[PDB]
From Swiss-Prot, chain B:
This is Multidrug efflux pump subunit AcrB. Disruption phenotype: Loss of susceptibility to contact-dependent growth inhibition (CDI); inhibiting cells still contact the target. It is found in: Cell inner membrane. Homotrimer, with large domains that extend into the periplasm, interacts with AcrA and TolC. AcrA may be required to stably link this protein and TolC. Interacts with AcrZ. Part of the AcrA-AcrB-AcrZ-TolC efflux pump. It comes from Escherichia coli (strain K12). The chain holds residues 754 to 803 of 1049 of the full protein. Belongs to the resistance-nodulation-cell division (RND) (TC 2.A.6) family.
């Protein structure tokens, strides 16, 4: 919090997880694939859609 | 007459090869080896049969 109220500089703080090198939050990790042609941009449009 | 691959262009975001070689029609019988000449140091274009 104390670091919110700071100029253009996102400053987080957080406590590491039990087993540093291992599967974090219950969250998910997803990866969107270019699966063909479509350049960087198409995929950015692509990404921003979802 | 024996192809050669200069180096790597990029197709549609997938690094792929690049080769210089003779159009088929200028490499099919020994007598064609008479088409190629070769800049000497005097700029004079000289031909293999020489």
């Amino acid at each position: 919090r104390a670091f919110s109220q700071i100029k253009d500089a996102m400053v987080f703080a957080f406590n590491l997880p039990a087993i540093v090198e291992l599967g974090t939050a219950t969250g998910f990790d997803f990866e969107l694939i270019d699966q063909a042609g479509l350049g960087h941009e198409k995929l950015t449009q692509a990404r921003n859609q979802l | 007459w024996g192809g050669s691959y200069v180096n790597d262009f990029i197709d549609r975001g997938r690094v792929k090869k690049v080769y210089v070689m003779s159009e088929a029609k200028y490499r099919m019988l020994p007598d064609d080896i008479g088409d190629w000449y070769v800049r000497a140091a005097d700029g004079q274009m000289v031909p293999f049969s020489a």
